[PDB]
């Protein structure tokens, strides 16, 4: 058939790229062989962890033997030793598959045995298709996955769903074209059609799925990629299968260029509970462009820029602010407070326990800042903020965000947070920050502007040698390609930044303050980040009023923050939105912001609205909530 054998082709080419996605593999194995155990040094039929093993390493195997570059590229002892391989693992499976049960080890270990090795039979069978071997290999597949996974969503007695049903789909369909069956045939099939209901993906506007803005949300309410990750290797498979059709392709690139950077750097308010800034496959989903990006309903900033990666996650009342397992409990402040540039040519340092507390703009109450958020269950328990209310503004090149925030769980922590992205830095305006009055016992809070894990090694000397050699002055000190300043704002209290140590683990940049000022809810601090190499003279107003900040990046790019308003104004085109998710805005409001701006009598004409009583109206505000208005 030419359907089989034109997917084997396409299978074959895309292998190492599809390899590229796949979360749970081994890259590059080069495990000895071994005739009793497939490899050396497992026990694959007493521990479970090692079948997966086997299963994981045979997979690897197979990608290179299948890669042009690869030493071992169609190396006949390799085809050998993957078809001697998968006899091995053939001759320890029971005929008739067990129900409810795993064949060996601890009856719940079910994992790979339905997930795993169909997935082993599929690249053994595919990629030793010119062989000697590959008639024995399909046979071998179809007997035993006509046993194993008799359906698209059943193995071994249990009905499977989800990310588990979204891995089987794929080496199932292929065992139906080898047993003779049209992809039209497959596609009637009930499990398959369960499966395309699955991987549909529509925008939904709450819950479990993708929201409307291209984020995707778990766990009812938790901002979590996870879910996504896992299975998006998948869907390269099922969209050649079954069609351009099946999978909301456009939401989902959209959802992953929200969050994710070419080199697998994703903000970690997104990312999993024990604290994460990076995914060692996401850099290899899409081609990611150049741009600066929002999801305004889900609360995420996002730019991509040719030298660095910055995100925010914001903060709504519709969603967490946080998520803690019996485990993972220390992770709020990172999820909820990062506002941190990292260069694209930097080393990728992740967080560990010792680290996780400390970031570029979190707000800290103690010395040693931990703040733990316990779950208040055997499992998860996630989290709303008291108050969430966030606006986002963008343009071509800069993007700002507007947080109001306050945090039950966090010693009633609240604040007003602006952020603005541009070419090539980051301003951070924390003001009216708060804590639950005399909570502190006596000791001053501080804002993180740089911090560093101790154990790594770089050139940069340590913060306070830096600060030594600068006549005494933190101003300008460099860490992993980003360099801090102090922004002044006259009118507004500005901490200088000293210099500290939190454990030994970490040091930091901060500034620090006092007790009395976070209880009166007074409290401000306010930096800068640059890309190593590229300054600018940016500088911040109090334009008059109390929460007016304009902030002039000296580029071309001016923004306001006017609370409940935020505004970026960038060549000839402005954006507003309101953290009150207004979807219409006053005259008066454009008038008032480019006074503030410093540009009163400014002519414009409307994007993406139109005149509706005394202003304008967004055309649509399904997806997006910001009003842009072109300067004639």
Same mark, same amino acid.
């Not at 089989?4 to 495990?31: G, H, T």
């Not at 085809?79 to 001759?91: E, F, H, K, T």
């Not at 139109?610 to 997806?623: A, C, E, H, I, P």
């Given at each position: 058939? +030419?359907?089989?054998?034109?997917?084997?082709?396409?299978?074959?080419?895309?292998?190492?790229?599809?390899?590229?996605?796949?979360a749970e593999?081994?890259?590059?194995?080069?495990?000895?062989?071994?005739?009793?155990?497939?490899?050396?040094? #497992?026990?694959?039929? @007493?521990?479970?962890?090692?079948?997966?093993?086997?299963?994981?390493?045979?997979?690897?195997?197979?990608?290179?033997?299948?890669?042009?570059?690869?030493?071992?590229?169609?190396?006949?002892?390799?085809?050998?030793?993957?078809?001697?391989?998968? *006899?091995?693992?053939?001759?320890?499976?029971?005929?008739?598959?067990?129900?409810? +049960?795993?064949?060996?080890?601890?009856?719940?270990?079910?994992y %790979?045995?339905?997930i795993?090795?169909?997935?082993?039979?599929?690249?053994?069978?595919?990629?030793?298709?010119?062989?000697?071997?590959?008639?024995?290999?399909?046979?071998?597949? *179809?007997?035993?996955?006509?046993?194993?996974?008799?359906?698209?969503?059943?193995?071994?007695?249990?009905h499977r769903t989800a990310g588990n049903s979204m891995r089987?789909?794929? =080496?199932?369909?292929?065992?139906?074209?080898? *047993?003779?069956?049209?992809?039209?045939?497959?596609? +009637?099939?009930?499990?398959?059609?369960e499966i395309?209901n699955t991987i549909a993906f529509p925008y939904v506007t709450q819950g479990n799925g993708l929201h409307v803005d291209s984020i995707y949300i778990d766990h009812i309410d938790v901002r979590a990629y996870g879910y996504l990750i896992n299975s998006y290797?998948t869907f390269?498979?099922?969209?050649?299968?079954?069609?351009?059709?099946?999978?909301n392709?456009?939401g989902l690139?959209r959802a992953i260029?929200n969050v994710g950077?070419?080199?697998?750097?994703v903000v970690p308010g997104v990312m999993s509970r024990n604290g994460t800034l990076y995914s060692?496959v996401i850099?290899?989903f899409?081609?990611? =462009? #150049?741009?600066?990006?929002?999801a305004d309903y889900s609360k995420v900033?996002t730019?991509?820029?040719?030298?660095?990666?910055?995100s925010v996650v914001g903060v709504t009342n519709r969603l967490a602010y946080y998520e803690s397992d019996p485990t993972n409990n220390i992770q709020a402040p990172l999820w909820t407070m990062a506002?941190?540039?990292? /260069?694209?040519?930097?080393?990728?340092?992740?967080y560990?326990?010792?680290?996780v507390?400390?970031?570029?703009?979190?707000?800290?109450?103690?010395?040693?800042?931990?703040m733990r958020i316990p779950s208040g269950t055997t499992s998860t328990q996630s989290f709303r903020p008291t108050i969430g209310?966030t606006?986002?503004?963008?343009?071509?090149?800069?993007?700002?965000?507007?947080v109001?925030a306050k945090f039950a769980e966090m010693?009633?922590?609240?604040?007003?947070?602006?952020?603005?992205?541009?070419? %090539?830095?980051?301003?951070?305006?924390?003001?009216?920050?708060?804590?639950?009055?005399?909570?502190?016992?006596?000791?001053?809070? *501080?804002?993180?502007? #740089?911090?560093?894990?101790?154990?790594?090694?770089?050139?940069?000397?340590?913060?306070?040698?830096?600060?030594?050699?600068?006549?005494?002055?933190?101003?300008? @000190?460099?860490?992993?390609?980003?360099?801090?300043?102090?922004?002044?704002?006259?009118?507004?209290?500005?901490?200088?930044?000293?210099?500290?140590? =939190?454990?030994?683990?970490?040091?930091?940049?901060?500034?620090?303050?006092?007790?009395?000022?976070?209880? @009166?809810?007074?409290?401000?601090?306010?930096?800068?980040?640059?890309?190593?190499? %590229?300054?600018?003279?940016?500088?911040?107003?109090?334009?008059?009023?109390?929460?007016?900040?304009?902030?002039?990046?000296?580029?071309?790019?001016?923004?306001?923050? /006017?609370?409940?308003?935020?505004?970026?104004?960038?060549?000839?085109?402005?954006?507003?939105?309101?953290? /009150?998710?207004?979807?219409?805005? =006053?005259?008066?409001?454009?008038?008032?912001?480019?006074?503030?701006?410093?540009?009163?009598?400014? +002519?414009?004409?409307?994007?993406?609205?139109?005149?509706?009583?005394?202003?304008?109206? #967004?055309?649509?505000?399904?997806?997006?909530?910001?009003?842009?208005?072109?300067?004639?």
């Amino acid at each position: 058939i +030419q359907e089989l054998q034109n997917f084997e082709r396409w299978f074959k080419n895309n292998l190492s790229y599809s390899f590229s996605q796949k979360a749970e593999k081994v890259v590059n194995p080069n495990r000895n062989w071994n005739d009793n155990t497939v490899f050396d040094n #497992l026990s694959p039929w @007493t521990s479970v962890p090692d079948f997966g093993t086997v299963c994981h390493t045979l997979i690897g195997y197979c990608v290179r033997y299948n890669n042009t570059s690869d030493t071992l590229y169609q190396n006949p002892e390799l085809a050998y030793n993957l078809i001697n391989g998968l *006899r091995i693992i053939c001759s320890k499976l029971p005929d008739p598959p067990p129900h409810q +049960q795993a064949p060996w080890g601890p009856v719940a270990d079910w994992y %790979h045995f339905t997930i795993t090795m169909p997935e082993v039979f599929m690249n053994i069978t595919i990629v030793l298709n010119e062989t000697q071997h590959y008639d024995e290999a399909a046979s071998l597949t *179809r007997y035993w996955l006509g046993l194993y996974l008799p359906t698209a969503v059943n193995s071994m007695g249990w009905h499977r769903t989800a990310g588990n049903s979204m891995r089987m789909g794929v =080496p199932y369909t292929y065992s139906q074209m080898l *047993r003779g069956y049209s992809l039209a045939q497959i596609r +009637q099939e009930q499990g398959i059609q369960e499966i395309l209901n699955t991987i549909a993906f529509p925008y939904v506007t709450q819950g479990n799925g993708l929201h409307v803005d291209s984020i995707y949300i778990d766990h009812i309410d938790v901002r979590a990629y996870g879910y996504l990750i896992n299975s998006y290797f998948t869907f390269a498979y099922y969209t050649y299968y079954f069609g351009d059709e099946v999978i909301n392709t456009v939401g989902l690139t959209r959802a992953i260029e929200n969050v994710g950077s070419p080199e697998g750097v994703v903000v970690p308010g997104v990312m999993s509970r024990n604290g994460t800034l990076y995914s060692n496959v996401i850099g290899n989903f899409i081609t990611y =462009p #150049l741009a600066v990006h929002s999801a305004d309903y889900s609360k995420v900033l996002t730019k991509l820029s040719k030298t660095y990666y910055g995100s925010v996650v914001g903060v709504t009342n519709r969603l967490a602010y946080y998520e803690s397992d019996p485990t993972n409990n220390i992770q709020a402040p990172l999820w909820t407070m990062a506002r941190r540039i990292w /260069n694209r040519r930097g080393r990728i340092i992740n967080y560990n326990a010792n680290t996780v507390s400390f970031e570029s703009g979190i707000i800290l109450q103690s010395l040693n800042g931990i703040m733990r958020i316990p779950s208040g269950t055997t499992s998860t328990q996630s989290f709303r903020p008291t108050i969430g209310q966030t606006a986002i503004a963008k343009t071509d090149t800069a993007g700002a965000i507007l947080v109001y925030a306050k945090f039950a769980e966090m010693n009633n922590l609240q604040f007003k947070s602006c952020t603005l992205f541009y070419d %090539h830095g980051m301003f951070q305006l924390y003001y009216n920050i708060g804590v639950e009055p005399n909570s502190l016992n006596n000791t001053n809070g *501080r804002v993180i502007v #740089l911090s560093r894990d101790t154990s790594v090694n770089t050139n940069d000397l340590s913060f306070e040698a830096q600060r030594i050699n600068n006549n005494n002055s933190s101003e300008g @000190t460099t860490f992993n390609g980003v360099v801090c300043h102090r922004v002044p704002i006259t009118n507004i209290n500005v901490p200088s930044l000293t210099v500290r140590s =939190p454990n030994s683990s970490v040091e930091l940049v901060e500034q620090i303050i006092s007790f009395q000022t976070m209880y @009166t809810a007074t409290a401000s601090a306010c930096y800068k980040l640059n890309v190593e190499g %590229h300054s600018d003279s940016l500088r911040a107003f109090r334009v008059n009023s109390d929460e007016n900040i304009y902030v002039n990046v000296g580029n071309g790019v001016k923004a306001l923050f /006017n609370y409940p308003w935020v505004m970026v104004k960038e060549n000839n085109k402005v954006s507003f939105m309101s953290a /009150n998710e207004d979807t219409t805005i =006053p005259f008066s409001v454009i008038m008032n912001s480019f006074t503030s701006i410093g540009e009163p009598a400014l +002519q414009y004409s409307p994007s993406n609205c139109f005149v509706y009583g005394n202003g304008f109206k #967004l055309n649509n505000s399904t997806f997006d909530l910001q009003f842009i208005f072109e300067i004639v």
